[PDB]
């Protein structure tokens, strides 16, 4: 931005319906401060948000330390507050060649007084005189009757703690809603009837994508199951309804003779295909690798399941 707002009246850009690349800010590294809270700066373009916000303002260098969760201070309490459960990044840089003026830059203002503290992301732009004393001020400036809003002494000769800094705070909002702000990961076409990884607007998982036998109403992009995970989705570019089936898996057990008689064993893969896991036997309980089969009934020795047992014969 060419110009930033005063900290008493910070700008709030509402961001939605965009492709967001945070790696770019990180990689340019033009910032002296680049600290993320509740989120990592390390190229996290994998996660997507319902909405994001970018709050922008100018403060003194020694005040940069207050732009964080869990803080108190003149800005943290009266000009710009973050929630203590905040997820977002604080980015800041020195503006000596932009915001410096001969005689001092007095365009940037901060709140010195209020009768209460601010809520997270609250703004207060009132100039009503603050009454510090016990008598009424009635709009009159004086001792114990303060204009609550004061200018910064941003002089061209000041040291670093007093230099103006341009601060942007990027807040990441995740709701049970489609992520409209999502990073520029390479777009790929969906592969049906195969086990794939998915990322639908930042919502990830693994499964086999199949045609749905149910329809969804037009107001929503996805459905969820008993564990609150994605059951099915509407593709975000073409509105097809596709179910996501968990990829085949199961416990693996070994059927073994005592290792004093023989060492021929088979591995039973519960509820999966023999092609997924020469002596290959497929049954309902699972697949046995290292085994043969007979269609006759006999006494049970080591059970497989569902009425079938393994045994040893020549």
């Amino acid at each position, epitope marked *: 931005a060419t110009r930033f707002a005063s900290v008493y009246a910070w700008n709030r850009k509402r961001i939605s319906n965009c492709v967001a690349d945070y790696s770019v800010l990180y990689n340019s590294a033009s910032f002296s401060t680049f600290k993320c809270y509740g989120v990592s700066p390390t190229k996290l373009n994998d996660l997507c948000f319902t909405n994001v916000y970018a709050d922008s303002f100018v403060i003194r260098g020694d005040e940069v330390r207050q732009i964080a969760p869990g803080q108190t201070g003149k800005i943290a309490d009266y000009n710009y507050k973050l929630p203590d459960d905040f997820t977002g990044c604080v980015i800041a840089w020195n503006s000596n060649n932009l915001d410096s003026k001969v005689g001092g830059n007095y365009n940037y203002l901060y709140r010195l007084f209020r009768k209460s503290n601010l809520k997270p992301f609250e703004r207060d732009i009132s100039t009503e005189i603050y009454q510090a*004393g016990s008598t009424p001020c009635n709009g009159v400036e004086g001792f114990n009757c303060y204009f609550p809003l004061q200018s910064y002494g941003f002089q061209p000769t000041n040291g670093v703690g007093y230099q103006p800094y341009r601060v942007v705070v990027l807040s990441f909002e995740l709701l049970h809603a489609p992520a409209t702000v999502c990073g520029p990961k390479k777009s790929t076409n969906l592969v049906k009837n195969k086990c794939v990884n998915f990322n639908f607007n930042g919502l990830t998982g693994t499964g086999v994508l199949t045609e749905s036998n149910k329809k969804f109403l037009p107001f929503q992009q996805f459905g969820r199951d008993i564990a609150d995970t994605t059951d099915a989705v509407r593709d975000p570019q073409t509105l097809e309804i596709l179910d996501i089936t968990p990829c085949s898996f199961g416990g693996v057990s070994v059927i073994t003779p005592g290792t004093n008689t023989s060492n021929q064993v088979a591995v039973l893969y519960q509820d999966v295909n023999c092609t997924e896991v020469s002596n290959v036997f497929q049954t309902r309980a699972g697949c046995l690798i290292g085994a043969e089969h007979v269609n006759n009934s006999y006494e049970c020795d080591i059970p497989i399941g569902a009425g079938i047992c393994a045994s040893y014969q020549t």
Partner: antibody
Amino acid sequence: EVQLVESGGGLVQPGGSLRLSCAASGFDLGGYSMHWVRQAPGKGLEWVAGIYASGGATAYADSVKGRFTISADTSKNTAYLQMNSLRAEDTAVYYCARSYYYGGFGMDYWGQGTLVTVSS
Amino acid sequence: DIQMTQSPSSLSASVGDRVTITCRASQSVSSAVAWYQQKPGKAPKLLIYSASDLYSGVPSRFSGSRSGTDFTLTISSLQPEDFATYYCQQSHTYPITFGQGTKVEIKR
């Protein structure tokens, strides 16, 4: 370079008056308040008076009210304290100082202080 | 008229040690507090003004902060030249009152 130079102290007997001056250099008076602070020998510090250079409005410590008058001159870039009705209880080192707004800000810079003494 | 309490009345510390002196106000004083250093035979020098702003000509060793209503003044490392009386002033509501002042000893 910012400097404050006090002058005009001396010995004045009870019932008399003494005028103190303090010159400013390296900065203006406009936009600032000017103050005087008193330090009696053997004691800590007590404020006497303050003036806003750009408004003319003043405030006085209750203990000096009616006797100690504060003023400032932005053409000369200097400030004054007119101390009348002096008593031996008013003997102190008198300091000049500057600050922002009427109050709510501390003093940035003090002069060295000029000593006045009185006795029986 | 806000009254100040400065504590401890005296502190002892060796050269190179970290020293903290605190001041508490009886009422709200915003960020109007000033920190002074006084040597025998000399006028108090200003170290800090308006709670956290360093005065020119003052070593970087002098710093401070506020938590709740407690104002803390710190010397990051005492030098032989820092064994002086310290004071707090609250320039908020007039008459302006100062604390008692405190001393620092060398531990000889």
